[PDB]
Amino acid sequence: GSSGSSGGSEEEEIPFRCFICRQAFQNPVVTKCRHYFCESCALEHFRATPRCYICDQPTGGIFNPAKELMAKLQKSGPSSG
Ligand SMILES: [Zn+2]
Ligand SMILES: [Zn+2]
């Protein structure tokens, strides 16, 4: 018996927790490579390696607030304060 299918609600290849520490995303920031990293991991890692930890790309000390990403996760959803 060689059969096994998978599915879901909507194609969402979005992570749930950090990968550098494998812990709950704490103040994750979105980069040009469309990736997220703990405000601490991004800074710490950046120090040693100026590139990414997953795509190992030239970030150039760039980091954007992925606050919107976290919001979606929460039950509420959108962030309209
Ligand atoms: Zn981390
Ligand atoms: Zn990356």
Domain ranges of the chain: 16-75
Where is 39: in which H helix or E strand?
Answer: helix 39-48
Q: Cα separation of 47 and 25, whole Å?
A: 20
Query: Which superfamily does 16-75 belong to?
Result: Zinc/RING finger domain, C3HC4 (zinc finger) (3.30.40.10)
Using the mean position of ligand 2's atoms as its centre, give its distance from the Cα of residue 78 in Å. 25
Q: Cα separation of 79 and 68, whole Å?
A: 7
How far lies 49's CA from each of 6, 45, 69, in Å? 37, 6, 25
A 10 A CB-CB count for 63 gives 18
Q: Cα separation of 17 and 30, whole Å?
A: 14
Using the mean position of ligand 1's atoms as its centre, give its distance from the Cα of residue 5 in Å. 32
Using the mean position of ligand 1's atoms as its centre, give its distance from the Cα of residue 17 in Å. 8
